[PDB]
Amino acid sequence: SHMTFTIDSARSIFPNTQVADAIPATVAAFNQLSAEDQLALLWFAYTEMGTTITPAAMSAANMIFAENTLNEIKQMPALDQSQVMCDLVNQADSPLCRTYSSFGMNVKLGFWYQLSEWMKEGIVAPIPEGYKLSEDGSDVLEAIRQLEGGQQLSVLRDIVVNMGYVKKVKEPVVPPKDLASRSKSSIEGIDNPTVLSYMDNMNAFDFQAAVALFAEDGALKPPFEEPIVGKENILAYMNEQCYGLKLTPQQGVSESAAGEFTQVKVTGRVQSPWFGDNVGLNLAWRFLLNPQGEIFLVAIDVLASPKELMNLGL
Numbered sequence: 001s002h003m004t005f006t007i008d009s010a011r012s013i014f015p016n017t018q019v020a021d022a023i024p025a026t027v028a029a030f031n032q033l034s035a036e037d038q039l040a041l042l043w044f045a046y047t048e049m050g051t052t053i054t055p056a057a058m059s060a061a062n063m064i065f066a067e068n069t070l071n072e073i074k075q076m077p078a079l080d081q082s083q084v085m086c087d088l089v090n091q092a093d094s095p096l097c098r099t100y101s102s103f104g105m106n107v108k109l110g111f112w113y114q115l116s117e118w119m120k121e122g123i124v125a126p127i128p129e130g131y132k133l134s135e136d137g138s139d140v141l142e143a144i145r146q147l148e149g150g151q152q153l154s155v156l157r158d159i160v161v162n163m164g165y166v167k168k169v170k171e172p173v174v175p176p177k178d179l180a181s182r183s184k185s186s187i188e189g190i191d192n193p194t195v196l197s198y199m200d201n202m203n204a205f206d207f208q209a210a211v212a213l214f215a216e217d218g219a220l221k222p223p224f225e226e227p228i229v230g231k232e233n234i235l236a237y238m239n240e241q242c243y244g245l246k247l248t249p250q251q252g253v254s255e256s257a258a259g260e261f262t263q264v265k266v267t268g269r270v271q272s273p274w275f276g277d278n279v280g281l282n283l284a285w286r287f288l289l290n291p292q293g294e295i296f297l298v299a300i301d302v303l304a305s306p307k308e309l310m311n312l313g314l
């Protein structure tokens with residue numbers, strides 16, 4: 001009397017999948033730096049991207065939620081403005097740091113975008129002119145710079161959402177696309193209707209229909225994060241982060257797994273609404289589907305290199 005799979009065990013499907021281990025490795029080294037090296041580093045890392053980041057639409061959609069905090073920061077004198085940003089990057093326990101944690105990912109990113117423009121403008125205390133990183137800061141920055149552009153964005157995203165204090169409810173409601181404006185996924189080697197439905201629903205921003213594909217104890221595991229377990233939790237996450245994505249699943253493989261479960265690996269690209277033209281992250285989706293065809297786990301990973309797109313069969 002036992003269990004074929006746990007979420008823990010499920011997470012080992014498809015072991016020859018190389019993830020971009022350098023992303024969290026670099027975030028971990030970033031976390032050892034001083035607050036002033038940290039903010040300067042993000043300044044340099046952010047600013048480097050230039051055109052790669054398309055900040056305009058997402059900022060606009062999300063700014064209602066950050067407006068009051070931002071304007072409160074706007075009215076502070078420079079030394080208070082610096083101190084608040086130091087509090088966020090240090091993960092201090094302040095009411096502002098807690099309000100920051102309650103913001104949705106896209107609100108957090110629009111917040112920092114606004115601070116980036118005001119810093120440029122000198123409405124917010126900028127990074128001191130000619131500020132120069134420590135040897136350790138400099139090294140984290142070169143590590144970032146060695147990554148593919150999408151992976152650098154992953155670093156930035158990871159750092160941003162983990163600032164402030166450690167239920168994300170302050171985000172906009174998601175409009176699903178019109179029924180007349182949706183796209184049907186085609187994946188080479190794969191006809192699995194759960195997988196195609198996951199792709200199509202996610203692409204249409206129909207997160208009720210995507211959550212409906214999961215088991216009651218099913219789980220969605222983002223890149224470098226713990227699994228999110230159960231429909232209410234998965235829907236909440238999808239509302240926070242999955243608006244505006246263009247998923248391009250390209251290939252995959254299906255195999256039977258123990259106890260009439262089915263294991264499905266897909267590789268492809270995502271484009272975030274924050275990304276430019278031709279920026280995509282290469283992803284794996286690794287599904288474990290129970291015998292009833294429902295998602296017990298889907299695990300999304302950023303791939304180490306484009307070589308991993310065709311790492312499929314066994």
Ligand SMILES: CC1=C(/C=C/C(C)=C/C=C/C(C)=C/C=C/C=C(C)/C=C/C=C(C)/C=C/C2=C(C)C(=O)CCC2(C)C)C(C)(C)CCC1
Binds near residue numbers: 042109112223285300
């Ligand atoms: C901080 C800071 C500053 C400003 C920083 C700014 C302004 C940063 C902007 C960064 C941005 C805009 C990054 C955006 C990145 C987006 C990424 C990398 C998203 C990837 C998405 C993926 C991989 C999604 C895939 C998924 C799929 C396909 C699924 O099947 C299910 C869900 C999910 C897993 C989500 C300044 C300069 C002031 C200095 C002081 C501190």
